[PDB]
Amino acid sequence: QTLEGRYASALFRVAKKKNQLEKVYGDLESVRNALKDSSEFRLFVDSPAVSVQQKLDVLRQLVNRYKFDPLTGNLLTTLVENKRLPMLARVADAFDAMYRKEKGEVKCLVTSAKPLSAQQQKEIVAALQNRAGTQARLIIDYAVSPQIMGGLVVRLGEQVLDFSVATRLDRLQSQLLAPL
Amino acid sequence: NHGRITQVIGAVVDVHFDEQLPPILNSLEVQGHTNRLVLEVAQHLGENTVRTIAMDATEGLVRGQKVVDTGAPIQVPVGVETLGRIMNVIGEPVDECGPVPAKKTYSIHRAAPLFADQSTEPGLLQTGIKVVDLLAPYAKGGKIGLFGGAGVGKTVLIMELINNVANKHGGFSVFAGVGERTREGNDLYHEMMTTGVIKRKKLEDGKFDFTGSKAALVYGQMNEPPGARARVALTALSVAEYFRDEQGQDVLLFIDNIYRFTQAGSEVSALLGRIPSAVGYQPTLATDLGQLQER
Amino acid sequence: NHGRITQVIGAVVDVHFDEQLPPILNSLEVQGHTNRLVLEVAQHLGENTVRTIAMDATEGLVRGQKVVDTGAPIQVPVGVETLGRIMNVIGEPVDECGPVPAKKTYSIHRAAPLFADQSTEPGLLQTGIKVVDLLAPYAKGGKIGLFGGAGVGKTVLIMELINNVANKHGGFSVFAGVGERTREGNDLYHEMMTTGVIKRKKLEDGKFDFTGSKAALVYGQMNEPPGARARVALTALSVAEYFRDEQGQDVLLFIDNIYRFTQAGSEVSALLGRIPSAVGYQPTLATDLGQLQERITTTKKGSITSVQAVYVPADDLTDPAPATTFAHLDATTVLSRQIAELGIYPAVDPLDSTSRMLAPEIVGQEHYDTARATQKLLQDYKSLQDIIAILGMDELSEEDKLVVSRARKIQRFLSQPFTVAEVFTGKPGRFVELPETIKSAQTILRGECDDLPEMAFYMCGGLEEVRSKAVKMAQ
Amino acid sequence: EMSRLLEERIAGWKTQTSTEEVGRVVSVGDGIARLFGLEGVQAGELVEFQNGMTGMALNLETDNVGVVIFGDDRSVLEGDSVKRTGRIVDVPIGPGLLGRVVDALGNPIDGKGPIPAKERRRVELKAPGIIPRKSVHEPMMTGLKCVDALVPVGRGQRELIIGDRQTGKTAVAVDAIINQKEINDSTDDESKKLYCIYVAVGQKRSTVAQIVKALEQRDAMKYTTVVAATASEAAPLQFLAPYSGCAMGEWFRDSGRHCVIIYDDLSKQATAYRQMSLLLRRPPGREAYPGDVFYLHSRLLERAAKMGDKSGGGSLTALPVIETQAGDVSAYIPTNVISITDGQIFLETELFYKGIRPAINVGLSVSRVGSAAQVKAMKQVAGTMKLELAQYREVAAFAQFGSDLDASTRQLLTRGTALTELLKQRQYSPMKNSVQVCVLYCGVKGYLDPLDPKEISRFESLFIDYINANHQDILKTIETEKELSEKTEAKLRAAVDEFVAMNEFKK
Amino acid sequence: KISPSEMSRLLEERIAGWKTQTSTEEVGRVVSVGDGIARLFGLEGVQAGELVEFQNGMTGMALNLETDNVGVVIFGDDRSVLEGDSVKRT
Amino acid sequence: GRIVDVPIGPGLLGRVVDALGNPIDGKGPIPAKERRRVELKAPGIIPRKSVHEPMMTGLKCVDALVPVGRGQRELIIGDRQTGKTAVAVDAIINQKEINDSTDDESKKLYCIYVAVGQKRSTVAQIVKALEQRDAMKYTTV
């Protein structure tokens, strides 16, 4: 639908067709992690002082100096040609949120503090029998409003299963304030 | 600099450069077609792209067409050689008598005089007309409205003012036609050549010898697009500022209509997409009239 | 909850929260700032982003500053401690007399009273002014409007009504200034401290004792942003709702230039991203006003009488703001410049003025008939203005000349020198009862004062003064 | 992690990282600019471009920054670097601006040197409140008979000079400026001295030069400063210049001194704000003006105030000026300013074409302060003058029938005509207060009724010279007591009798 | 807000490395149609005021050249034109 | 899944309700079982007939010079405070005699007063004026 949605759908389709999925799959994770860890690649992408030629040159140097497919390089050249390089992170998020999807999903998830290997195993196996997707590489997080009960988002958008304490509590209260 | 056209929307040309963008109001020359086309920058947009107003028609233009940056705004020639001649907004002559062999050129966009370089002593202008010098005395550095069409003796009043100011004050004069009828311009030119305001004497080889005359002419024809008729009065004003500053003279400046100046400004603002003011006029009306008239 | 400023546009602030959002209308305090900047949430935009309107100036803000959510809307104190005290929109006193030691605080935003909790009982007010006592009687426990341009005497009329009502009221009262001059605000404060409406006492230890006061004050003036002008009337209405809900008392509520309540929205919606209506006004021009007016209503608990001054830009009564405001009023008084240019003050147009408390089932039939006869006379005089301007009075018949004479006489008789005008008029004030006005109007209509001149009715009050002035002018 | 790659390829990457204090232009046009960077920039902050041009950080979007350029859009290019000055838009103040013409931002133009600097008070400050403010209880000597009598201007007031073009607004302003010379030179005490500020907005530069020349001629620049934002100057500078003048006057307001600012054109400020808004794509309204015009003018005019006893006691008056179109005051801007001001001085083209100059009407001109801005000596006379002029205005409808009318009506017409011919004055010729009191006493005591109208000029002049030659003791007694006791009144009547004796007139 | 070059049929080529830009400056593809107007992608080289010709024999004038498209005014009805048609320069 | 709809019936007679049929009189719920869609198709050309019955307005100038039928759509246009609401309230009040002096529902005239933009004080005054004359047993608001 959106711009990043269009580019992500095109990349998903073409990589399902011609080259492979796993190469671009690993590429998107590496690119996002470089964006979120370097702290200067982001400014290189957003800044307009960088010329289009310097942009393409640095992108081709990253291609050569890293495990990189031609499809992602053509994607980056297209985003540069259309002035959509700042939409890299967004595109990556969309490509990870339908999608990045044939092999294994990445999901967010929240607790109060450090859980244990036992209930971690239980959580992953329960979410695996619920998903029936054989690959799941998740996230841990800590937000204490939902008191301790495990809330999460298995990343496909229309499933945010809100297994929490405070949320069920407030929903119940607002339900049972109904008249008669 | 050298750039390329990216799109053409009527009289609004968007141009792309690779490095060292030109400032606003600078001039750009298109290359790759006849009828030499000049574009005045007006706005930066990003992506090393700029927007320009054309001084002539844009029919026959192509995307990717090459453009050169002159490095300065529209530069009109100045001198005593511009006396008796006619000139367009880009300084070129349209009288079919040769080029202007002037030793100098001035930009049409010049800052007004400062607060220090200004005379505090007002003084009348000795024209030589009785009703004028009696009941509506003129002034030096002044601006006089002239409400009247044809059938009244306006062109003759103009020529008399020119001749008397040239005889007594020794100062030359300028006439600017801001979107005037072409037959009216021809009539005025022939009336000047008859009355002696212009002295166009043939030479043996076939050139002309514009000897001591009393008026330069600057015509922005009505068939010209918006962008010329708005930058014509500035051309004539620079031509007059040349005589004022260097020669140190008290000159005149006749303007055929300032409402067409305002029409052209409003048109240009509508093309560039500026939101119009109360009655359709531009939001830069008083500002443009002041940029003109404070010189 | 903590949040970050991401974008700033004049009187609008876009904030970003991480964990949990605040609801709409909630208050936020900016921390890295000199003064106490407060932001009122107005919209939600996604990405956990919020849009807010600032109650003070945004000069000094930074993209990154920190903001704290108070969890509730703006809270103004209430009680008998607000009496005899000025309070800005955020409740902070600017009287330089100490803090407000009130127990309870009310929210600026409250839902209006329901349909069943209303009581439309017809009463009258004793204003002492002839024009309103005769042709536009004011309703005790209802809304009253003074519509006018600039320089027609709204502030003077409100000050006269204050002098003639609030001092002779006994109950409580409130005055809101929404984009009016600080000069007249200070003047009202000092006139109240003079007349005893405000009773300030300085204790030995620097504290103050406002016990005995009978009027609160809320001032958001021209030296304030739109956010601090579109939220002052609501503060004053909360302060009055506390009285007329808990204390059960009947209150007055004088408001000066309610039009600013819309003007602020006009200089805010462009920055909030809304499409303009006909003359740049909002699409919410009617609801933003009705949500304010429906809180003003007599109920079974207490009563709010209200007196609102409504600006009229460019002397155009067809503007959307006054057009909408006309529908919410129980009594009306439209001032005119054409009548003020004649030196008549108050410059009330008695034909554009109207009321709901003029029917014979409220006022008597003699009052009703006198009012309707005066209106008929003035309309018959208006109908001859064109032919008098072109041709002249000589073309007219004798009945029409008598009509014109009586209409000019009753125009000049419907003019009163107020007490607060003594500073720029010199002549002393004239309180006027209703039966004297009615007798004078009856006599002028019958023809018992045709012998007198026309300039003998100018600024005289009753008829004995008119006759004494005619006697003195005979010399 | 990977910064070596960018440093190697871009060749200058390490310097463009600190986008918190340095930024880069992106777009330019219509006096507006867009910058990428400057994350720690304050709103309203002053910004310095590459070529010395300056601007105001108006809007702070999520990524870009929208800046208003105090100049023409030719010294600013896409790609130019931009710095932070680290301070809000500010202007210099204090002693050092007196006798100095300056631009909107305190930069001099008359070519006489730089200007010293205080801590540079801000421009868009907030006005005072209710407690420190004080009512007006002392006058502002303008030097015009009609103004000082019927339309008195106080010290802490905001009174409007409204009228069509070519009616004598700048003349009133410059006379008000010139009349303060004797009062300032004769005092040497800044509590009684009155400084001044003259803000020109959209005014012709030659006119401003002529005004400055006439003030230097009459020594009226020791205590005045001028702020010029003319028609050639950009629109942001016309928008600012009033606020800069008000910031220059706040020093006098807050230091116990007294001042008066004269904005000679506020409609041009409003036109420039309309321009900037339409170029910022804001939604127009009535006559294309936005809704922030009332706020625009009120921000500026609400600063004029009379501080109280504990806030020093200073003051700041304000004489804003407005040009109308065919005398229409039912427009939007005149009504917006009348709803802000504390009075009104109206000017007409009819009286100015007839010959009455200053063409100050009196039925439309008003003043809320009134007698409180007058001295008792001038009260006692201007009251009678106002009453008699009201009577004359009333009974002037039937003046052609003066022969058919009673002697009372003819006496009223004669007195009114004499007063109207007595209120006239020349350009650049003010009058002291004692002289005004003497002249109006002569007028209101029937000494001009039999006298011919045209003679009243030379009559007045001779009388003035007489009381400036012999009765200086009377003048000093009036200036000291501020009252017309019976003794001074009898002395004045004796002097008037001696003058009518020693002088011959047409009647 | 999407450009004609950003539609999801060309990006399947660009991502796939297809470099079939040998489509000349003479030929373009219709992108939108309505009310006597057409909007094309291509014809980088067409003059302003130039005539162009559609599949079904009809002709039009190119007026609004743009960075991403070309605006054409039609000398006839819109029933003949439909999205996806080809246009060639005369 | 419900399209916006409102209740209908004689349970509305004598009651005051909001736009959605929720009562605001404060005395009991709305006893009505059948609902109706808000936006509907008007009836066509065939299921109609000419206007032949009068609608007694109670006034004289209306009933004589500007008559009103049953099936008409007549505008009342004027300025503010001119007697617009009073005409309608008199039209409502004139019907209580016609309805009391019959039990034929084909001859009784029921009434509906839609108050858009008015203030609740005005609506309460109108309800009071109707209750004072027993003109609510055949009207709804």
DSSP string, chain E: ---GGGSTTTHHHHTTT---TTS-SSEEEEEEEETTEEEEEE-TTPBTTEEEEETTS-EEEEEEE-SS-EEEEESS-SSS--TT-EEEE-
Q: Residue B213 — left, alpha, or beta (φ > 0 → left; ψ -120 to 50 → alpha)?
A: beta
Identify the three-state secondary structure at position C101.
coil
Q: State which H helix or E strand residue C220 sits in.
A: strand C216-220
**Number of CB atoms found within 10 A of residue A101's CB:** 17
Q: How far is CA C392 from CA C66, D398, F54, in A?
A: 74, 15, 50
Asked if residue D7 belongs to a domain, the reply is: no
Q: Which tokens sit at C416?
A: 């009163």
Cβ burial, residue E75 (10 Å; 0-12/13-18/19+): exposed
Of D344, D374, D404, the residue at which a domain comes to its end is D374
Residue B115: how many other CB atoms lie within 10 Å: 20
Contacts of C63 (CB under 8 A, 6+ apart): C5, C6, C7, C8, D39, D40, D41, D60, D62
Instruction: Let me know: does D270 contact D207? Beta carbons within 8 Å.
Output: no
User: Would E3 be classed as within a structural domain?
Assistant: no
Q: How far apart are CA C100 and CA C82, in angstroms?
A: 7
Cα distance between residue D393 and residue D362, in whole Å: 9
Which residues on A lie below 8 Å from E18 (Cβ)?
A: none
Residue B247 has a CB neighbour count (10 Å cut-off) of: 13
Quick one: tokens of C285?
A: 């021009």
CB atoms within 10 A of CB D384: 18
Q: Answer for the pair C302, C251: CB distance below 8 angstroms, yes or no.
A: yes
Are D385 and D445 in contact, with CB atoms under 8 Å apart? no
Which residues of chain E does A95 touch, with a Cβ-Cβ cutoff of 8 Å? none
Contact between B286 and D271 under an 8 Å Cβ cutoff? The reply is: yes
Nearest to A73 by CA among A81, A48, A97, E8: A81
Contacting residues for F78 by C-beta, under 8 A, at least 6 apart:
F84
Q: Is D124's CB within 8 Å of C57's CB? A: yes
* Cα–Cα distance measured from residue D335 to residue D324, given in angstroms and rounded to the nearest whole number: 11
CA distance D134 to D126: 17
Strand-pairing partners, residue C29, are C38, C68
Which helix (H) or strand (E) segment holds residue F92: the answer is helix F84-93
Sign of CA dihedral F99, F104, F107, F112: positive
Distance (Å, rounded) from C-alpha D456 to C-alpha D448?
A: 7
Q: Within 13 Å and on the Cβ side, how many CA atoms surround F83?
A: 5
What is the rounded CA–CA span in Å between residue E56 and residue E60? 12
Q: Tell me the one-letter amino acid at F18.
A: D
- Of the candidates D200, D417, D39, B256, the one whose C-alpha atom is nearest the C-alpha of residue C61 is D39
User: Residue D111 has which token pair?
Assistant: 């070519």
d(CA E72, CA E88): 12
What are the tokens at A170? 């407030």
| Element spanning D69, H or E | strand D64-69
Structural domains counted in chain E: 1
Q: What is the Cβ-side half-sphere exposure of residue C313, based on CA atoms within 13 angstroms? A: 22
- Determine whether the interchain pair B7/E45 forms a contact, defined as Cβ–Cβ distance below 8 Å: no
Tokens describing residue C324: 């909408």
Please name the residues in contact with D172: beta carbons below 8 A apart, sequence gap of 6 or more.
D142, D144, D147, D161, D345, D358, D360
Of the candidates D385, D505, D402, the residue with the CA atom closest to the CA atom of residue D454: D505
What are the distances in angstroms from CA B245 to CA B73, B74, B117, D364? 20, 19, 11, 49
Q: Is D138 helix (H, G, I), strand (E, B) or coil?
A: coil
Query: Beta partners for C68?
Result: C2, C29
Question: In the block, which residue shows the tokens 């009012």?
Answer: C371
Q: Domain of E67? A: 26-90
Q: Which H helix or E strand runs over C42?
A: strand C38-46
Beta strand pairing call for D260-263 and B38-46: unpaired
What length is written for chain E? Answer: 90
- Three-state DSSP string of chain B: CEEEEEEEECCEEEEEECCCCCCCCCEEEEECCCCCCEEEEEEEEECCEEEEEECCCCCCCECCCEEEECCCCCEEECCHHHCCCEECCCCCCCCCCCCCCCCCEEECCCCCCCCCCCCCCCCECCCCCHHHHHHCCCECCCCCCCCCCCCCCHHHHHHHHHHHHHHCCCCCCEEEEEEECHHHHHHHHHHHHHHCCCCEEECCCCCEEECCCCCEEEEEECCCCCCCCCCHHHHHHHHHHHHHHHHCCCCCCEECCHHHHHHHHHHHHHHHCCCCCCCCCCCCHHHHHHHHHCC
Residue B121: Cβ within 10 Å count = 7
Pairwise CA distance, residues C147 & D146, whole Å:
33
CB D245 within 8 A of CB D237: no
Report CA D50 to chain centroid distance, whole Å: 36
Q: Give residues 16 to 75 of E whose Cβ lies within 8 Å of A.
A: 16-17
Q: Which of D369, D347, D372 is nearest to D358 (CA)?
A: D347
Confirm whether residue C181 is marked as ligand binding: yes
Task: Give me D251's structure tokens.
Answer: 């020093």
* D296, D246 Cβ separation under 8 angstroms: no
Residue D315: beta bridge partners? D306
Question: What is chain D's length?
Answer: 507
Whole-number Å distance between alpha carbons of F63 and C424? 57
Q: Does residue D172 fall inside a structural domain?
A: yes
Q: What span, in angstroms and rounded, lies between the C-alpha atoms of C105 and C103?
A: 7
- Does D1 map to a domain? no
Query: Is D74 in the same domain as D127?
Result: no
Burial class (CB in 10 A: 0-12, 13-18, 19+), C244: buried
- Sequence length of chain F is 141
Rg (CA), chain C: 25
CB C183 within 8 A of CB D342: yes
B120 annotated to a ligand binding site = no
Burial class (CB in 10 A: 0-12, 13-18, 19+), D307: buried
Residue ranges with strand state E in C221-364: 250-256, 303-311, 331-334
Of D38, D71, D87, the residue that ends a domain is D87
Radius of gyration, alpha carbons of chain E: 13
Contact F92, F139 (CB under 8 A): yes
Instruction: Please state, in angstroms and as integers, the Cα–Cα distance from residue B107 to each residue in B236, B242, B292, following that order.
Output: 11, 11, 13
DSSP H/E element including A18: none
Query: Do residues B53 and B14 make contact, with C-beta atoms less than 8 angstroms apart?
Result: no
D16 marked as binding residue: no
Chains contacting F (3 or more CB pairs within 8 Å): C
Question: What do you get for the CA distance between the two ends of chain A, in Å?
Answer: 45
Neighbours of chain C (3+ CB pairs under 8 A): A, D, F
Would an 8 Å CB–CB cutoff place C468 in contact with chain D? no
b/e C25-55 (16+ beta carbons within 10 angstroms → b) = ebbbebeebeeebbbbbeeeeeeebbbbbbb
D284 located within any domain:
yes
Is-catalytic flag, C181? Answer: yes
Question: Could you give the C-alpha distances from B192 to B163, B200, B202, B215, C233, in angstroms and in order?
Answer: 11, 10, 16, 9, 73
Distance between first and last Cα of chain C:
82
Which residue, chain included where needed, has tokens 């300025």? F79
As beta bridge partners, residue C306 has C143, C253
* Bond into C345 cis (ω within 30): no
d(C-alpha B251, C-alpha C163), whole Å: 69
Beta bridge partners of B86: B217
> Mutating which of C4, C267, C337 best tests the D interface, going by the most D Cβ atoms within 10 A?
C267
Is the Cβ–Cβ distance between C267 and C261 less than 8 Å?
no
Pairing of strands B75-77, B105-107: antiparallel
Question: Whole-angstrom Cα distance, residue F39 to residue F41?
Answer: 7
The answer to whether D237 and D229 have CB atoms below 8 angstroms apart is: yes
Give the method used.
cryo-EM
- How far is D253 from chain B, CA to nearest CA, in Å? 29
Q: How many helices (H) and strands (E) does chain D have?
A: 16, 15
Same-domain pairing of D222 and D97: yes
Q: Which two tokens stand for residue C214?
A: 């009978």
- Residue B82's nearest CA partner among B213, B190, B196, B233 is B213
B245 Cβ contact list (under 8 Å, min separation 6): none
**Other C-beta atoms lying within 10 Å of the C-beta of residue B267:** 18
Q: Decide if E65 is inside a domain.
A: yes
- Pairs from D443-448 (Cβ < 8 Å, separation ≥ 24): D443/D385, D443/D418, D443/D419, D444/D381, D444/D384, D444/D385, D444/D388, D444/D415, D444/D419, D445/D493, D445/D496, D446/D415, D447/D496, D447/D500, D448/D418, D448/D419, D448/D421, D448/D422
Q: Is D22 exposed, middle or buried (0-12, 13-18, 19+ CB in 10 A)?
A: middle
Domain-terminating residue out of D349, D374, D399? D374
Bridge partners (DSSP) of residue E62 are E50, E72
Distance CA D270, CA C57 (A): 21
Sign of CA dihedral C282, C288, C290, C296: negative
B-facing residues of E in 25-44 (CB < 8 A) are: 44
Q: Are D475 and D432 in contact (CB under 8 A)?
A: yes
**Nearest C-alpha neighbor of C357 from the set C391, C326, C322, C330:** C330
Report the DSSP beta bridge partners of residue D344.
D366
- Contacting residues for D254 by C-beta, under 8 A, at least 6 apart: D307, D311, D312, D314
**Residue of E15, E41, E67 to mutate, interface with A, max A Cβ within 10 Å:** E15
Portion 403-442 of C in contact with F at CB < 8 A: none
Domain identity same for D245 and D147: yes
Taking a C-beta distance cutoff of 8 angstroms, is the pair B221, B183 a contact?
no
- Strand duo C27-30 + C12-17: pairing: unpaired
Residue type, B92: E
Report CA C59 to chain centroid distance, whole Å. Answer: 32
Residue D13 contacts A, CB cutoff 8 Å = yes
Listed residue (D393, D331, D341, D385) closest to D367, CA to CA: D341
Pick the catalytic residue from D120, D133, D205, D368. Answer: D368
Long-range own/partner contacts, residues B112-116 (CB < 8 A, 24 or more apart): B112/B291, B112/B294, B112/B295, B112/D205, B112/D232, B113/B294, B113/B295, B113/D205, B114/D109, B114/D111, B115/D101, B115/D109, B115/D110, B115/D111, B115/D205, B115/D208, B115/D209, B115/D228, B116/D109, B116/D110, B116/D111
Same domain, D229 and D176: yes
To what resolution in angstroms was this structure determined?
4.8
A61 interface with D at CB cutoff 8 Å: yes
How many Cβ atoms sit within 10 Å of the Cβ of residue C86?
24
Nearest to D374 by CA among D188, D134, D157: D157
What DSSP state is assigned to residue C236?
H
The reply to whether D432 and D313 lie within a common domain is: no
Which residue, among F50, F122, F54, F30, has the nearest Cα to F84 in the 3D structure?
Answer: F122
Handedness of CA C286, C288, C289, C290 (dihedral sign): positive
CB B81 within 8 A of CB B260: no
Asked if E52 has any chain B CB less than 8 Å from its own CB, the reply is no
Angstrom distance (rounded) from CA D152 to CA C76: 42
Residue D37 structural domain? 21-87
Task: Quickly count: other Cβ atoms within 10 Å of residue A53's Cβ.
Answer: 10
Q: Classify the C-alpha dihedral F96-F98-F104-F105 as positive or negative.
A: negative
The C-alpha atoms of residue D277 and residue D290 are separated, in whole angstroms, by 7
Domains held by chain D: number: 3
Whole-angstrom distance, CA of residue E5 vs CA of residue E39: 13
Could you tell me how far CA C70 lies from the centroid of its own chain? 32
Q: Cβ of C120 and F123 within 8 Å?
A: no
Nearest to C141 by CA among C281, C27, C307: C307
CA distances from residue C214 to C80, C175, D162, F23 in whole angstroms, order as listed: 9, 11, 41, 40
Residue D2 falls within a domain, yes or no? no
Alpha carbon distance D156, D177 (integer Å): 16
